[PDB]
Write a protein that binds this ligand. Structure first.
Ligand SMILES: [Zn+2]
Ligand SMILES: [Zn+2]
Lengths: 767, 716
């Protein structure tokens, strides 16, 4: 008899929702990502920015080796702060730059203890003593409040931004504003399905909406244009041409950019010249007959252009199918099937050619990020194409078997949302820790050369990096554990800037405390990324072996050390890990860790990358979808309907339901679905009148439809991807795909099967 | 008269032999010093001939295949003719049926020793003009080059095909006719490309394209583009030369024609405004600190680019020649452009090599529009895809040829084992020729002898044509007829025919042994045909038929043609380029410049190229082929500085100063390579150009000293 995932979600929504969470206490434990509440910085960093597996580290390594609870944090450095909460403050320390500890190089933060009248401060991290610089000196007070503590943000707040001096910039010189390079596949495939014209016509409108700060009047971001089909087609759109010039490069293999000017021009200046091009491009390649394209050189070109302009930039690549034309990065159709019993199973989740890794390194080294809008209709090898846009901090948008009358809106919504994304450029993150522990492993859309610096060519509000800690040395129950995430980047106006997040966590040597301070959602996010990364290095049966046995070991350790004595017939779980078994089982049911029968690899590789970028709020939804009852829904109640368990056991034949995992939204209809709703939603009289293949928005509707659509909008709100709606009919229909997302059912094993499987190895760890 | 014999045989057959009467033995011919050679102009001006409207008739023997000519005997009763060269019997065509001794066909008439036939191949191909433009120059020069290019575009026939490539740091092959936007294909100016590669890259098939389109169709579009053409955008750092990819842009222009229109008439016209600084075909470095090659730099082996670069254009020239296309080079800059390295392209093809100061000069613009001079019927005076075949009598063998041509390596009976220059063949390919284009053919001896010249070419009007020239000279028993042979000697023709040979050796590794060999022959000639008692230099004398020859050798050995070390490598390449082309008349001028004198005391009269001719009361007009110089005498210079001219009293004096300027104007329009004009006077800074032009046999010396040494060596 287990408390469901939903019982917990609502129980925490009731006792913590609608209340202000203040980050004052050290090691405080925040509400769940599912529980909406107001957050005031007041000392430590908001959980919107950074959450942890445990908000109380084991004081020593052995203890940590006991419980086998992973010590990790999920950092979303640029998370979209709500309108009602205090925005970040920009701190300037003059020519000297931000005051830092001379040893561990931690920036000035609330964790600095000011001593000796205010002339010296002892580092909260490395306990090193520093001299307070002249321009920054101030007198202490009764116990060292110093008197500007509530005046200066970097002394009282956990989240803020520093201004970076010239010694923080490349070549010690002020960086240039980034550039958006739009690159379009123009082969036969994208011409026919009307995608090229769609991109062209719509890009006229959305080039206006290019990000710009309030302090300036017009976006400093420049724009460039390229097409390709086994050959590159550059364009000259200077602000003194009545007609755009095209310069075609055929020397693929030794690519180059044939222009320095006329490329990358302020959109407002060259407005008429640009619109002149976007009118022509659909007509220009209208009768194109090419069946092969190139890819690596395209990224190579867009990267080479940004190096020449001496500026960072983003590559908005639109591609259709598998790049086959002979070139570097030429891909084959290597979907050989090897799995489960094959150790070399990993290769499938690896790029074919060696050139992608190098290409990715060159991009990150020059501040170039690539975002890929992909429109496959066949094998495309996501493992290869997605490598460069993953490592660079970009995004990947895949639209399986794209059809205009259906997936048009989905794509345009993704495009708009991606252009308008608040984005940094040429970013590098460094996670510093207090004496006793350190960052040892990282998980994100990132690339690393050394073992300390996380390089992200671009980072947006949605991206998140997960960090793993290990024990450097024994900890202190008094001082605890300190973490400082520092992100050095460049803005869309070309300024060098530092964003800093400080978080203080308590240390205990008591195994009781660790369990008490555990977040299940955050723990899952780590295990997901850790396993999904191991996929490229180990057999899948090995990793699972690891997941189940580490799950059983945590619950066995809680059983034998903290739990007040109970029967052997019972399995004892802490309240923090009430629902850890259920979620863990869903991780093992994911196709990423399951097999090829019934699933393309492309789909396996796509999902594998998707999770690696996720934050806690997103990881919670993808693994345990939201299932809303729509038939019982009150009319204009009109609060969002309560969630119902992710199984077929909660589905009624007289019922209409909505299930969402953040990427796919399914509307489910029972066979005995009440015709009153089917009319007031689908505008057709009966059940057998609806067509699944007509999965477009049914805007029309007087009472229920406005009402029902409503709940579909709020679900989408905090979500970066616009979801592919899929309407389903209950029997022998496309229900087969829908059932996969019912994660409490068998389909791997079910929930009660895994709970009994954990309790067996919990009794195998005898004593 | 023997002078009348030469003047008539040149004007008729377009030929001039070193000897007009031949020795019947190989020995006494070898003894005669000068080989029996001939200047030959295939398309000599000949308005008196109407092209025969019909196919030529050929000998049945395969190895022979000579064309029907006046020499062959005929038997109208049998309708048969006997080939003069081999004696095989041949049968006339059915059409020739009504042939008789009084209404005989054209090709049998002595007046038609040389005539032109009209071939009916049936593939009528349009002309092709490929503009390869350098953009690394100031806005002044480029603008003027654009005007001259828009000008040239207007003269071309409506059906001709035009194409444009513009280069600089990179090479741009533009697509014309593409209206509303302007695409172009770009390549790295550092990577070489083959014909096949470029065919594939540009998206073409095998054997009008998107690049080569009709003038009528694109006159408006191309011109506008030329109009919007601006210089190389890529900025040039200080102390550095622009990145100019001359070698690469040429290899593209050549290959572009090699895979679209092979074996048809085409001119690739590359205009450069500086040296190649980014190879292959690299001429010199990009840093201005390093100066370009100096005959001294290249002689001391301090020129690290020459050998590599020359090799590149050498292969490019051979490619273009083989495909049958013409390469022109118009190099206008303030320093050397690397014409030494690029010379083999307009040398092996029949292309023009044009040197200059800038494209914005009255020098260039004029020279360039003389390229497209139309004849009496509005057709260009150009020829394309020339095939030259030479058949000789069985007692004569072709050594080889010197001039704008390429060996086809056609072996036969007429091909000599001892081959000279471009030899080992009886056939040559001349991709481009003009009524001026003149070769030097060298023969060998082993009742008259006869030689036939057959030239197949594509006329500028798209017509295929054949130019057959049949000549003959009388044999002689050089043991009884030494006098006959010596009187048939052409001192003018031999002087040029020997000059080319000498220069041709200057091209080759042989060094200053040229002076040594050239004099050895001059001595040998004086010893055989000179009137003298032995060891008496005073007794030595030359018949008039020879008198001017030593004087010709004197000016040859001291000319810029062999004495390069007072000119730049490009100038030496330019000078030699035109001498190997011209007919006898222009060739003599180059060697020995003409000097006229103007004065109150008589009409304009040519004088000796000596210091003696320079008098105070005399205006001199010196005419070397490449420059026109007017020299005012000391007295006349002062009258000119004082202002006597404007005064109405001295009507005569204003005319005296005008008399040579008037004549200097005529020559500044007729001559194709428009010469540099120089107006100087006694004590002028540019008086250096005059006085300079005014064991081994001898060092620089008076003509007399040179002769005196010649006189005493010939008698011993
Ligand atoms: Zn420190
Ligand atoms: Zn014959």
């Amino acid at each position: 008899a287990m408390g469901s995932p939903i019982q917990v979600i609502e129980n925490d929504r009731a006792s913590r929702g609608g209340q202000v969470y203040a980050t004052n206490t050290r090691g405080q434990i925040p509400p769940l990502v599912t529980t909406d509440c107001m957050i005031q910085d007041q000392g430590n960093a908001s959980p919107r920015f950074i959450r942890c597996t445990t908000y109380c580290f084991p004081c020593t390594s052995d203890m940590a080796k006991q419980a086998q609870i992973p010590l990790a944090a999920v950092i979303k450095p640029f998370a979209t702060i709500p309108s009602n909460e205090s925005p970040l403050y920009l701190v300037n320390h003059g020519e000297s730059g931000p005051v830092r500890c001379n040893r561990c190089k931690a920036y000035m933060c609330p964790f600095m203890q000011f001593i000796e009248g205010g002339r010296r401060y002892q580092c909260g991290f490395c306990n090193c003593v520093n001299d307070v610089p002249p321009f920054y000196f101030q007198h202490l007070d009764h116990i060292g409040r110093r008197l500007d503590h509530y005046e200066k943000p970097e002394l009282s707040l956990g989240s803020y931004e520093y201004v970076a001096t010239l010694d923080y910039c490349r070549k010690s010189k002020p960086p240039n504003p980034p550039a958006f390079i739009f690159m379009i596949d123009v082969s036969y495939s994208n011409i026919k399905n009307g995608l090229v014209k769609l991109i062209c016509e719509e890009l006229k409108t959305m080039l206006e909406k290019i990000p710009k700060e309030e302090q300036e009047e017009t976006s400093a971001i420049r724009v460039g244009f390229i097409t390709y089909n086994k050959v590159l087609h550059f364009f000259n759109v200077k602000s003194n041409l009545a007609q755009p010039q095209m310069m075609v490069v055929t020397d693929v293999g030794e690519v180059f950019v044939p222009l320095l000017d006329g490329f990358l021009v302020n959109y407002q200046e060259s407005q008429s010249v640009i619109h002149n091009l976007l009118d022509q491009i659909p007509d220009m390649f209208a009768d194109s007959n090419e069946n092969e394209t190139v890819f690596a050189p395209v990224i190579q070109a867009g990267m080479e252009a940004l190096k020449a302009a001496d500026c960072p930039g983003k590559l908005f690549i639109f591609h259709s199918s598998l790049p086959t034309a002979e070139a570097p990065g030429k891909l084959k159709n290597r979907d050989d099937k090897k799995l489960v019993n094959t150790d070399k199973e990993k290769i499938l989740f690896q790029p074919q050619t060696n050139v992608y890794d190098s290409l990715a390194k060159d991009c990150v080294a020059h501040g170039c990020s690539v975002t890929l809008f992909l429109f496959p209709s066949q094998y495309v090898d996501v493992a290869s194409l997605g490598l460069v846009p993953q490592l660079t901090g970009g995004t990947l948008y895949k639209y399986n078997n794209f059809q205009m009358h259906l997936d048009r809106q989905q794509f345009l919504n993704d495009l708009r949302n991606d252009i308008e994304k608040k984005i940094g450029f040429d970013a590098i993150m460094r996670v510093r820790t207090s004496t006793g522990f350190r960052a040892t492993d990282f998980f994100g859309g990132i690339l690393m050369n050394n073992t300390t610096d996380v390089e992200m060519a671009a980072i947006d509000c949605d991206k998140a990096v997960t960090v793993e800690f290990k024990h450097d040395d024994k900890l202190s129950e008094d001082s605890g554990a300190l973490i400082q995430c520092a992100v050095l980047y460049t803005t869309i106006s070309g300024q060098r800037r530092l964003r800093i997040h400080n978080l203080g966590l308590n240390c205990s040597s008591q195994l009781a405390d660790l369990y008490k301070s555990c977040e299940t959602d955050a723990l899952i996010n780590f295990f997901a990324k850790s396993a999904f990364k191991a996929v490229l290095h180990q057999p899948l049966k090995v990793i699972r072996e690891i997941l189940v046995n580490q799950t059983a070991h945590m619950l066995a350790c809680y059983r034998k050390n903290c739990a007040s004595p109970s029967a052997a017939s019972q399995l004892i779980l802490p309240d923090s890990m009430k629902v850890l078994p259920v979620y863990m089982n869903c991780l093992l049911k994911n196709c990423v860790l399951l097999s090829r029968p019934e699933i393309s690899t492309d789909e396996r590789a796509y999902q594998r990358q998707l999770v690696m970028t996720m934050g806690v709020a997103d990881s919670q939804l993808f693994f345990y979808p939201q299932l809303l009852p729509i038939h019982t829904l009150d009319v204009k109640s009109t609060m969002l309907p309560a969630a119902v368990r992710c199984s077929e056991s909660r589905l009624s034949e007289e019922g209409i339901f909505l299930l969402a995992n953040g990427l796919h939204m399914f509307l489910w209809l029972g066979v005995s679905s009440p015709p009153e709703l089917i009319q007031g939603i689908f505008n057709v009289p009966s059940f057998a009148h609806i067509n699944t293949d007509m999965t477009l928005l049914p805007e029309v509707g007087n009472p229920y439809s406005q009402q029902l659509r409503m709940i579909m909008g709020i679900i989408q709100q905090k979500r970066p991807y616009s979801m592919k709606l899929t309407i389903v009919k209950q029997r022998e229909q496309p229900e087969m795909v829908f059932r996969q997302f019912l994660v409490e059912d068998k389909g791997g094993s079910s929930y009660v099967d895994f709970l009994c499987c954990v309790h067996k190895e919990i009794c195998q760890l005898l004593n | 008269t023997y002078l009348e014999f030469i003047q008539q045989n040149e004007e008729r057959d377009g030929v001039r032999f070193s000897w007009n009467v031949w020795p019947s033995s190989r020995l006494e011919a070898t003894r005669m010093v000068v080989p029996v050679a001939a200047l030959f102009t295939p398309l000599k001006e000949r308005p008196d001939l109407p092209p025969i409207q019909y196919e030529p008739v050929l000998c049945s023997r395969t190895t022979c295949r000579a064309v029907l000519n006046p020499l062959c005997q005929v038997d109208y009763r049998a309708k048969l003719w006997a080939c003069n060269f081999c004696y095989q019997r041949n049968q006339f065509p059915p059409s020739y049926a009504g042939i008789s001794e009084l209404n005989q066909p054209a090709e049998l008439l002595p007046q038609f020793s040389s005539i032109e036939y009209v071939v009916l191949r049936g593939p009528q191909m349009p002309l092709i003009f490929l503009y390869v433009v350098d953009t690394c120059m100031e806005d002044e020069d480029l603008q003027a080059l654009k005007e001259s290019m828009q000008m040239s575009l207007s003269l071309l026939p409506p059906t001709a095909l035009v194409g444009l490539i513009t280069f600089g740091r990179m090479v741009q092959v533009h697509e014309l006719g593409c209206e509303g936007i302007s695409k172009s294909y770009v390549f790295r100016g550092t990577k070489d490309l083959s014909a096949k590669q470029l065919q594939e890259m540009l998206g073409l098939s095998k054997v009008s394209n998107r690049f080569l389109q009709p003038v009528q169709k694109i006159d408006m579009n191309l011109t506008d583009l030329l109009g919007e053409l601006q210089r190389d955008p890529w900025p040039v750092p200080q102390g550095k030369r622009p990145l100019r990819s001359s070698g690469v842009a040429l290899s593209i222009a050549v290959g572009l024609l090699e895979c679209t229109f092979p074996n048809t008439g085409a001119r690739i016209m590359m205009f450069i405004g500086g040296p190649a600084t980014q190879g292959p075909g690299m001429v010199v470095g990009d840093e201005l600190k390093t100066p370009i090659r100096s005959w001294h730099d290249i002689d001391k082996d301090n020129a690290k680019y020459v050998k590599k670069g020359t090799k590149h254009f050498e292969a490019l020239a051979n490619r273009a020649a083989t495909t049958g296309h013409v390469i022109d080079i118009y190099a206008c800059a303030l320093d050397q452009t690397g014409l030494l390295e690029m010379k083999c392209c307009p040398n092996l093809t029949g292309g023009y090599m044009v040197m200059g100061d800038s494209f914005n000069t009255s020098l260039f613009k004029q020279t360039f529009q003389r390229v497209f001079t139309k004849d009496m019927h509005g057709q260009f005076k150009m020829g394309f895809g020339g095939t030259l075949e030479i058949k000789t009598s069985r007692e004569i063998k072709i050594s080889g040829a010197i001039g704008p041509c390429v060996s086809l390596n056609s072996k036969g009976p007429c091909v000599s084992e001892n081959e000279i220059g471009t030899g080992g063949t009886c056939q040559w390919k001349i991709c481009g020729l003009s009524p001026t284009t003149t070769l030097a053919i060298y023969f060998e001896v082993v009742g008259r002898g006869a030689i036939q010249f057959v030239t197949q070419y594509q006329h500028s009007s798209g017509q295929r044509r054949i130019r057959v020239t049949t000549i003959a000279r009388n044999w002689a028993d050089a043991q009884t007829q030494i006098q006959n042979i010596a009187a048939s000697f052409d001192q003018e023709a031999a002087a040029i025919l020997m000059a080319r040979l000498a220069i041709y050796r200057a091209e080759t590794e042989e060094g200053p042994d040229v002076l040594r060999w050239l004099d050895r022959q001059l001595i040998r000639l004086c010893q055989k045909f000179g009137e003298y008692h032995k060891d008496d230099p005073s007794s030595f004398r030359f018949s008039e038929t020879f008198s001017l020859y030593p004087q010709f050798m004197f000016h040859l050995r001291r000319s810029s043609f062999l004495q390069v070390f007072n000119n730049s490598p490009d100038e030496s390449s330019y000078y030699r380029h035109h001498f190997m082309r011209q007919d006898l008349t222009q060739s003599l001028i180059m060697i020995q410049p003409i000097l006229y004198a103007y004065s109150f005391s008589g009409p304009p009269e040519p004088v000796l190229l000596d210091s003696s001719s320079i008098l105070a009361d005399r205006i001199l007009l010196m005419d070397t082929f490449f420059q026109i110089l007017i020299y005012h005498g000391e007295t006349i210079a002062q009258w000119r500085k004082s202002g006597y001219q404007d005064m109405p009293e001295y009507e005569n004096f204003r005319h005296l100063l005008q008399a040579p300027v008037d004549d200097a104007q005529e020559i500044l329009h007729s001559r194709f390579p428009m010469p540099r004009y120089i107006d100087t006077e006694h004590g002028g800074s540019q008086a250096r150009f005059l006085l300079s032009k005014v064991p081994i046999l001898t060092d620089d010396v008076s003509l007399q000293v040179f002769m005196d040494h010649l006189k005493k060596l010939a008698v011993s």
